[PDB]
Amino acid sequence: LGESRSEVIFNEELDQAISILNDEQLILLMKRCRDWNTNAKTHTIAQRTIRCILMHHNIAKLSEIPGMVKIVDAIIPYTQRHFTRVDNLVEQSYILDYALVEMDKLF
Amino acid sequence: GGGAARRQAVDVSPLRRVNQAIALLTIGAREAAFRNIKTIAETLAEELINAAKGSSTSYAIKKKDELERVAKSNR
Amino acid sequence: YNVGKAEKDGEIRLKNGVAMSKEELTREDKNRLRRALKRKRSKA
Amino acid sequence: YQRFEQAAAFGVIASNANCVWIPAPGQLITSALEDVNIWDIKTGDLVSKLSDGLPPGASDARGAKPAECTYLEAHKDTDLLAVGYADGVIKVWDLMSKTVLLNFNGHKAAITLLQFDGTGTRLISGSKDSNIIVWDLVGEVGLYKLRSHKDSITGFWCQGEDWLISTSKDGMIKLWDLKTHQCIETHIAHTGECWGLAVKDDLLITTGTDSQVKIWKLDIENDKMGGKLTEMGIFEKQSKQRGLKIEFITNKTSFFYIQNADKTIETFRIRKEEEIARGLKKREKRLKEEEIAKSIKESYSSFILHPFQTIRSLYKIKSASWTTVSSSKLELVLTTSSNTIEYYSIPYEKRDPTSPAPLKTHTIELQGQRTDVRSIDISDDNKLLATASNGSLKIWNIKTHKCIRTFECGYALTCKFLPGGLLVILGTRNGELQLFDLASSSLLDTIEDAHDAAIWSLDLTSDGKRLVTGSADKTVKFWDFKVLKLHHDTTLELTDDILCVRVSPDDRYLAISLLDNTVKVFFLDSMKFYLSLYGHKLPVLSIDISFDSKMIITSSADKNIKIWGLDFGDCHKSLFAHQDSIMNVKFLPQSHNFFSCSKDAVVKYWDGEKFECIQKLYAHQSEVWALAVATDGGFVVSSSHDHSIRIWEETSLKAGERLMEALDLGIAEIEGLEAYNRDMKLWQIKPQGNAVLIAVNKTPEQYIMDTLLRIRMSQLEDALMVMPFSYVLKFLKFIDTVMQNKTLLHSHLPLICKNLFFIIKFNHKELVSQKNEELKLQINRVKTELRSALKSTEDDLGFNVQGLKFVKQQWNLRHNYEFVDEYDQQEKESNSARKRVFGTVI
RNA sequence: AACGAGGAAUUCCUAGUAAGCGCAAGUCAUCAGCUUGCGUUGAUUACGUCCCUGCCCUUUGUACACAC
């Protein structure tokens, strides 16, 4: 990620590796991805690997894969928590817009 | 200061200013009538008049001048 | 889904959701994690 | 209350050590215990030894067993000797003044290998615990540490300034790059434990643990695993027990030797390409008379290599070293386990040994007991007696520290001397007393069948007229001198074995142990069974009685000296000492003070009236076997299983505020470098980067971010409340800069955003009262970049949430069974939903 | 003839508190070289901080949301 902060998500060859992963390794990757999704300091990494998977596999297959909708079911609610907190942060970030208004009006 | 003590200047808050004011006046008149023919009423009247002038012949104004000088020295 | 101890043996998994294999730790770190589990289960 | 200090050490010619040979046969370095020794081979005469000045025994010394000297290797171009002691301490000696010039202590365990290039004065050390240190002798500091092995280090070969190749006691070989300063390559070598490593510029030869030597090809190619190390072949058939040391040598047919741990040693020749081509053609003609080429590729190893010969030397060897001459003689210096240092030579003409056997020259076995000392004796303050189960009764002069006569008597057990005639007596684990002369031959009257078992203890009365020999036949026999033969006269047949006997210096009591934890005390004059002392829970091993027949000292296997008073037969005083076991105890010849030597290498000196260990003596590191005290002088001679003879002679800031200081430094470097950028752009001199940023090698944003990161969340609101307004302006510039460095921004986006919004809500009145077009532009940049960051992160989150819900819904409407009746499916659902238990107070 | 409100050091002290002023009792231990009660006039200065000298404490969110 850090090197690819400058339609890709990571470096493209890495994306190809994730695209041609096996089913068993997809299960293992999503197990680790759910684990890192738990805390809120590694959620970005979890979200990016998930998005790379969803954009590079057959979704009917991903739904089909045995013993995975268990994992998916544990993955949604923490991502809603993160979504709500980040949206709250956009919300607080309109302060700067307020201060700019006040400063130009003084000016 | 670890052994090397030194006076640093700080500002003072009005309840402390008023408490100093009252203490300075009354200590000045009590020690000015410690042993004389004067008494507390007359020495204290002397002091309150002079200090309200600010005229610097009086106990409390001398001690005030001292303390702003010491701050002025090592701020 | 809370996170608790990993169902293999080859891993140690902490509470903040980070998991580490037994192999890929340097020996001092294997020491220090043994110390941490020592005192934690020493109370509980 | 005098104190004793060590004065001597004999018989310690070479042990537990790795020899370094000096060409002039020339001189040779071995180590004593705790000590080095150098000597000429052909004369066998000691030159020098190196140690710390204060001996063990001066009261300044520390209470610990001294460190054994476990490795040593030299540099003749600078003529220094780097030795390493088993406390993992490295000492370098000058060889001219024979003085230390510096020391080192970096390891923790014992040191295995020293290897060093004085060319740049690089010193390399590999200890028992797995790390390799590299040092500079000129700067005498620690350069660095290479650590990735797991068990130990057993071999490593340096090369130049670039590479190490090391092998461990767990069988993997590791190549280390010294530039990037770290491991590069690793290969498991043998199944068990690999031990030896020797390098020719082509090929690398290692040993396994069961006589499989393996042959790699080495290079400097730059593939990942490829190019570097490759797996040419397996040669074998040295012995069965594993080898330890391989060394190459040349003149130019080259040779190398494997030193094993058995009695033997092997030497091989390595051939040349002409013989290689010849054998190739001969083998190919055998091939013709494909897969057959695969077979010759498999017999590669035996094809190239060649078994030159062996030495079936004697019993056991520690170390070995090469010497070549004339292309017709190869020579091995050979340090054994037992006290011998032998020279070996072999003729050859680059074709053949031309000899039925290797030749043994120049042994050194003269002043070394060559086995384990079983007993000691002192004689008239001039004369010393050392006996060992090789029989090698070595007679010594103390003041010359040197041998006089040596005999042989089989598995000797106990020594004693006769001042009358100056004739020594010994006894063995077979019942045969052997009495020897000193000027003449040994055997004068070698008695046999004196006891059907091993004899154990033997003493003579204060005159020198009779011999009491207690022996494991459960019998003691009493013998008299006739004129010079010995005649037994009477036998006492007890019930159990005898483990010690002594008689009073006034000649009245006889003390005889038993195998039971008991000792009997008899009247000598008529054999009357005067007393029986009881109670050690383990048998008595050694007995003393006083200089004047007042007390009896008994020392046994359960580590407790007991002091009995002899008169009524009482136990004065018990004394737990010597964590292993006591072998013996002796009195001073004058007074009630006594020495005691254990099985765990301590000599403890007691007062017999306060009953305290006056002194503890920490000379050496083996089971002490015996002790004897001078008849007058107070020097005492202690002897122990390390083949060793010792003589003791008688003589700040607050969080928030540290953020402000970091903020000052960071903003200073940032704005200075910006002004310099403006300067060069106007042109078309670097303002100096400050010490902290340079020294930690941290860019300014990383510095300020690290101080912000270290601060804790309970102190973050207070800290940002503390700083004044000028520092807030600096904070805003810093946030602008990290928006320039996006990677840092997305790394620490919550920290930055929280701090920014708090510091602005708090300083809002100032902030709008400031009018600066710089500040407006800064706020536009910061606000737009924060929206960009937060917004793209959020967009990830929305996409993931929708997608995972869609995945689950799809799987539901294909797999999970569906009903039609509303109540029926409600029953289904309230079955299958997650149930979590919870502890309510009612 | 000794004395004109008691040196260095240390101790004690936050509201009917410090300090003054007298009256009364004498209670199975203690108390008359005195001890406990009872009223009467009645303040100056802090009421913050862990910076100093110390003194404890926790370093396993675990209890159940939400947040951190």
mmCIF file of N, CA, C and O in Angstrom, chain D residues 87-134:
data_model
loop_
_atom_site.group_PDB
_atom_site.id
_atom_site.type_symbol
_atom_site.label_atom_id
_atom_site.label_comp_id
_atom_site.label_asym_id
_atom_site.label_seq_id
_atom_site.Cartn_x
_atom_site.Cartn_y
_atom_site.Cartn_z
ATOM 1 N N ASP D 87 34.559 -18.656 29.861
ATOM 2 C CA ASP D 87 33.554 -17.692 30.237
ATOM 3 C C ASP D 87 33.278 -16.774 29.045
ATOM 4 O O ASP D 87 32.781 -15.660 29.187
ATOM 5 N N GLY D 88 33.668 -17.204 27.855
ATOM 6 C CA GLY D 88 33.438 -16.401 26.681
ATOM 7 C C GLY D 88 34.179 -15.096 26.664
ATOM 8 O O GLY D 88 33.649 -14.099 26.169
ATOM 9 N N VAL D 89 35.390 -15.068 27.197
ATOM 10 C CA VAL D 89 36.168 -13.841 27.252
ATOM 11 C C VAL D 89 37.385 -14.022 26.366
ATOM 12 O O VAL D 89 37.996 -15.093 26.341
ATOM 13 N N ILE D 90 37.684 -13.011 25.573
ATOM 14 C CA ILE D 90 38.758 -13.094 24.604
ATOM 15 C C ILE D 90 39.889 -12.194 25.049
ATOM 16 O O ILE D 90 39.698 -10.991 25.258
ATOM 17 N N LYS D 91 41.066 -12.784 25.200
ATOM 18 C CA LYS D 91 42.260 -12.080 25.616
ATOM 19 C C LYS D 91 43.300 -12.252 24.532
ATOM 20 O O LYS D 91 43.495 -13.358 24.032
ATOM 21 N N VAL D 92 43.967 -11.174 24.175
ATOM 22 C CA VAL D 92 45.053 -11.234 23.217
ATOM 23 C C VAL D 92 46.362 -10.973 23.943
ATOM 24 O O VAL D 92 46.469 -10.040 24.749
ATOM 25 N N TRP D 93 47.340 -11.826 23.697
ATOM 26 C CA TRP D 93 48.650 -11.669 24.292
ATOM 27 C C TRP D 93 49.655 -11.221 23.248
ATOM 28 O O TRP D 93 49.682 -11.733 22.124
ATOM 29 N N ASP D 94 50.493 -10.272 23.647
ATOM 30 C CA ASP D 94 51.801 -10.129 23.042
ATOM 31 C C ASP D 94 52.615 -11.388 23.279
ATOM 32 O O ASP D 94 52.438 -12.087 24.273
ATOM 33 N N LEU D 95 53.513 -11.685 22.354
ATOM 34 C CA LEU D 95 54.380 -12.834 22.523
ATOM 35 C C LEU D 95 55.813 -12.475 22.839
ATOM 36 O O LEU D 95 56.591 -13.368 23.189
ATOM 37 N N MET D 96 56.193 -11.211 22.720
ATOM 38 C CA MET D 96 57.542 -10.799 23.063
ATOM 39 C C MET D 96 57.663 -10.417 24.530
ATOM 40 O O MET D 96 58.453 -11.015 25.265
ATOM 41 N N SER D 97 56.866 -9.457 24.985
ATOM 42 C CA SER D 97 56.826 -9.156 26.406
ATOM 43 C C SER D 97 55.993 -10.156 27.180
ATOM 44 O O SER D 97 56.049 -10.144 28.413
ATOM 45 N N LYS D 98 55.281 -11.030 26.473
ATOM 46 C CA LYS D 98 54.221 -11.894 26.991
ATOM 47 C C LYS D 98 53.370 -11.157 28.021
ATOM 48 O O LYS D 98 53.328 -11.473 29.208
ATOM 49 N N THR D 99 52.733 -10.103 27.529
ATOM 50 C CA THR D 99 51.779 -9.314 28.285
ATOM 51 C C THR D 99 50.512 -9.155 27.464
ATOM 52 O O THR D 99 50.556 -9.100 26.232
ATOM 53 N N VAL D 100 49.377 -9.092 28.156
ATOM 54 C CA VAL D 100 48.132 -8.754 27.489
ATOM 55 C C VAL D 100 48.229 -7.332 26.975
ATOM 56 O O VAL D 100 48.897 -6.481 27.573
ATOM 57 N N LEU D 101 47.624 -7.078 25.826
ATOM 58 C CA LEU D 101 47.471 -5.703 25.406
ATOM 59 C C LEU D 101 46.030 -5.224 25.373
ATOM 60 O O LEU D 101 45.811 -4.019 25.528
ATOM 61 N N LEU D 102 45.049 -6.115 25.212
ATOM 62 C CA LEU D 102 43.650 -5.717 25.355
ATOM 63 C C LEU D 102 42.796 -6.954 25.603
ATOM 64 O O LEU D 102 43.265 -8.087 25.495
ATOM 65 N N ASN D 103 41.528 -6.713 25.939
ATOM 66 C CA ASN D 103 40.556 -7.765 26.189
ATOM 67 C C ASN D 103 39.254 -7.497 25.465
ATOM 68 O O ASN D 103 39.058 -6.454 24.852
ATOM 69 N N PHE D 104 38.369 -8.479 25.563
ATOM 70 C CA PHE D 104 37.061 -8.501 24.938
ATOM 71 C C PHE D 104 36.123 -9.381 25.735
ATOM 72 O O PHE D 104 36.514 -10.451 26.193
ATOM 73 N N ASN D 105 34.865 -8.966 25.847
ATOM 74 C CA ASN D 105 33.861 -9.828 26.470
ATOM 75 C C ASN D 105 32.496 -9.552 25.850
ATOM 76 O O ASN D 105 31.772 -8.655 26.277
ATOM 77 N N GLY D 106 32.141 -10.344 24.857
ATOM 78 C CA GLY D 106 30.888 -10.104 24.194
ATOM 79 C C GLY D 106 29.957 -11.287 24.229
ATOM 80 O O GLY D 106 28.742 -11.127 24.143
ATOM 81 N N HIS D 107 30.499 -12.482 24.349
ATOM 82 C CA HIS D 107 29.658 -13.662 24.306
ATOM 83 C C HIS D 107 29.011 -13.884 25.659
ATOM 84 O O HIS D 107 29.025 -13.025 26.540
ATOM 85 N N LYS D 108 28.421 -15.049 25.839
ATOM 86 C CA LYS D 108 27.997 -15.425 27.168
ATOM 87 C C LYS D 108 28.498 -16.816 27.486
ATOM 88 O O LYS D 108 28.877 -17.101 28.619
ATOM 89 N N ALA D 109 28.526 -17.680 26.506
ATOM 90 C CA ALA D 109 28.889 -19.055 26.753
ATOM 91 C C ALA D 109 30.346 -19.257 26.412
ATOM 92 O O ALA D 109 31.086 -18.307 26.226
ATOM 93 N N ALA D 110 30.777 -20.503 26.342
ATOM 94 C CA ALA D 110 32.155 -20.786 25.995
ATOM 95 C C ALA D 110 32.406 -20.543 24.518
ATOM 96 O O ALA D 110 31.497 -20.622 23.693
ATOM 97 N N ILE D 111 33.664 -20.276 24.183
ATOM 98 C CA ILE D 111 34.078 -19.898 22.839
ATOM 99 C C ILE D 111 34.549 -21.114 22.081
ATOM 100 O O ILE D 111 35.369 -21.882 22.580
ATOM 101 N N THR D 112 34.056 -21.282 20.869
ATOM 102 C CA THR D 112 34.585 -22.374 20.082
ATOM 103 C C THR D 112 35.701 -21.937 19.155
ATOM 104 O O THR D 112 36.799 -22.481 19.221
ATOM 105 N N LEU D 113 35.453 -20.996 18.258
ATOM 106 C CA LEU D 113 36.440 -20.729 17.224
ATOM 107 C C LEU D 113 36.879 -19.283 17.220
ATOM 108 O O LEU D 113 36.049 -18.377 17.196
ATOM 109 N N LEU D 114 38.180 -19.073 17.165
ATOM 110 C CA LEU D 114 38.747 -17.785 16.832
ATOM 111 C C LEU D 114 39.353 -17.892 15.463
ATOM 112 O O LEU D 114 39.908 -18.927 15.113
ATOM 113 N N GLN D 115 39.241 -16.832 14.695
ATOM 114 C CA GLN D 115 39.764 -16.833 13.349
ATOM 115 C C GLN D 115 39.939 -15.378 12.998
ATOM 116 O O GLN D 115 38.987 -14.605 13.129
ATOM 117 N N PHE D 116 41.137 -14.985 12.591
ATOM 118 C CA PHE D 116 41.319 -13.553 12.523
ATOM 119 C C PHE D 116 42.390 -13.165 11.542
ATOM 120 O O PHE D 116 43.399 -13.853 11.389
ATOM 121 N N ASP D 117 42.148 -12.036 10.909
ATOM 122 C CA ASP D 117 43.012 -11.476 9.895
ATOM 123 C C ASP D 117 43.649 -10.236 10.499
ATOM 124 O O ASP D 117 42.986 -9.213 10.653
ATOM 125 N N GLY D 118 44.937 -10.295 10.789
ATOM 126 C CA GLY D 118 45.551 -9.089 11.287
ATOM 127 C C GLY D 118 45.784 -8.052 10.223
ATOM 128 O O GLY D 118 46.273 -6.964 10.531
ATOM 129 N N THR D 119 45.426 -8.382 8.981
ATOM 130 C CA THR D 119 45.663 -7.528 7.827
ATOM 131 C C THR D 119 45.010 -6.171 8.006
ATOM 132 O O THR D 119 45.642 -5.128 7.818
ATOM 133 N N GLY D 120 43.728 -6.171 8.351
ATOM 134 C CA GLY D 120 43.068 -5.004 8.897
ATOM 135 C C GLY D 120 42.813 -5.111 10.381
ATOM 136 O O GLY D 120 42.079 -4.278 10.927
ATOM 137 N N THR D 121 43.402 -6.105 11.053
ATOM 138 C CA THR D 121 43.138 -6.440 12.448
ATOM 139 C C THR D 121 41.649 -6.679 12.684
ATOM 140 O O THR D 121 41.008 -6.033 13.501
ATOM 141 N N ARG D 122 41.111 -7.620 11.930
ATOM 142 C CA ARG D 122 39.775 -8.140 12.126
ATOM 143 C C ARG D 122 39.859 -9.417 12.936
ATOM 144 O O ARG D 122 40.657 -10.298 12.627
ATOM 145 N N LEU D 123 39.034 -9.508 13.966
ATOM 146 C CA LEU D 123 38.960 -10.665 14.846
ATOM 147 C C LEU D 123 37.568 -11.249 14.770
ATOM 148 O O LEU D 123 36.591 -10.520 14.939
ATOM 149 N N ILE D 124 37.456 -12.552 14.537
ATOM 150 C CA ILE D 124 36.155 -13.179 14.388
ATOM 151 C C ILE D 124 36.045 -14.339 15.351
ATOM 152 O O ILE D 124 36.938 -15.188 15.417
ATOM 153 N N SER D 125 34.940 -14.386 16.078
ATOM 154 C CA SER D 125 34.774 -15.336 17.159
ATOM 155 C C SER D 125 33.424 -16.008 17.087
ATOM 156 O O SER D 125 32.406 -15.333 16.955
ATOM 157 N N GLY D 126 33.406 -17.320 17.249
ATOM 158 C CA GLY D 126 32.157 -18.048 17.294
ATOM 159 C C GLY D 126 32.042 -18.922 18.520
ATOM 160 O O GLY D 126 32.844 -19.835 18.706
ATOM 161 N N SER D 127 31.055 -18.669 19.355
ATOM 162 C CA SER D 127 31.020 -19.259 20.675
ATOM 163 C C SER D 127 30.085 -20.441 20.715
ATOM 164 O O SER D 127 29.650 -20.948 19.690
ATOM 165 N N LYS D 128 29.782 -20.904 21.921
ATOM 166 C CA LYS D 128 28.863 -22.017 22.040
ATOM 167 C C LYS D 128 27.442 -21.587 21.770
ATOM 168 O O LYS D 128 26.657 -22.380 21.265
ATOM 169 N N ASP D 129 27.076 -20.363 22.107
ATOM 170 C CA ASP D 129 25.757 -19.918 21.702
ATOM 171 C C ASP D 129 25.887 -19.149 20.411
ATOM 172 O O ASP D 129 26.877 -18.471 20.166
ATOM 173 N N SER D 130 24.876 -19.217 19.641
ATOM 174 C CA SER D 130 25.006 -19.236 18.215
ATOM 175 C C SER D 130 25.499 -17.996 17.599
ATOM 176 O O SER D 130 25.529 -17.983 16.397
ATOM 177 N N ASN D 131 25.950 -16.920 18.197
ATOM 178 C CA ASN D 131 26.290 -15.746 17.419
ATOM 179 C C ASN D 131 27.771 -15.623 17.125
ATOM 180 O O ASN D 131 28.607 -16.071 17.904
ATOM 181 N N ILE D 132 28.083 -15.007 15.991
ATOM 182 C CA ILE D 132 29.447 -14.742 15.552
ATOM 183 C C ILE D 132 29.743 -13.271 15.759
ATOM 184 O O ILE D 132 28.994 -12.419 15.284
ATOM 185 N N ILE D 133 30.811 -12.960 16.429
ATOM 186 C CA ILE D 133 31.159 -11.562 16.608
ATOM 187 C C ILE D 133 32.285 -11.235 15.664
ATOM 188 O O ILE D 133 33.141 -12.078 15.385
ATOM 189 N N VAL D 134 32.302 -10.006 15.165
ATOM 190 C CA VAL D 134 33.461 -9.483 14.459
ATOM 191 C C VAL D 134 33.891 -8.187 15.127
ATOM 192 O O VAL D 134 33.046 -7.362 15.499
#
